[PDB]
């Protein structure tokens, strides 16, 4: 509950509404049957074991249904991912000093130094080279996102 304990009362209320779209009988639990109904409304045709698998990913207590606390943990994890994505785009905008969509070595040097980083010139060059998948000498947004993706 450490993740869910980080949510505001307002976020909890939004998420209670989201939970209700799954928990259509209002009994406090999302079942595989309920999930299947939602997935079919999304144009999917899952199997029972697929639904069970989806439940299992969220079902911290192993009881086979999703309660509100488990739902809140899931939503808190999604919020954290959204926040991380936002931090990465905002950092890209700064590192790409001229806004042209590519981080050059010179730009990276400037930003690093202005942030008080003491990286040597070789280290800056290395950072560009490692991230530069396409070989054009600079780092585009998708290259940056890949570089910042956990392992």
């Amino acid at each position: 509950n450490a993740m869910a304990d980080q949510l505001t009362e307002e976020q909890i209320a939004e998420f209670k509404e989201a939970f209700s779209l799954f928990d259509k009988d209002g009994d406090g639990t999302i079942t595989t049957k309920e999930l299947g109904t939602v997935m079919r409304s999304l144009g999917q045709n899952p199997t029972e074991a697929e639904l069970q698998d989806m439940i299992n990913e969220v079902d911290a207590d192993g009881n086979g249904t999703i309660d509100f606390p488990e739902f809140l943990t899931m939503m808190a994890r999604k919020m954290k991912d959204t926040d991380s994505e936002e931090e990465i785009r905002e950092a890209f905008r700064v590192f790409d000093k001229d806004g042209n969509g590519y981080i050059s070595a010179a730009e990276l040097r400037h930003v690093m130094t202005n942030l008080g980083e003491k990286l040597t010139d070789e280290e800056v060059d290395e950072m560009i080279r490692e991230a530069d998948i396409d070989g054009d000498g600079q780092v585009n947004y998708e290259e940056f996102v890949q570089m910042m993706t956990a392992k």
Binding site: E117, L119, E130
Partner: peptide, 13 residues
């Protein structure tokens, strides 16, 4: 690695 350096800089931002 390069990722850690980029990350350390992002935390300064």
């Amino acid at each position: 690695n390069a990722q850690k350096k980029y990350y350390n800089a992002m935390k300064k931002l």
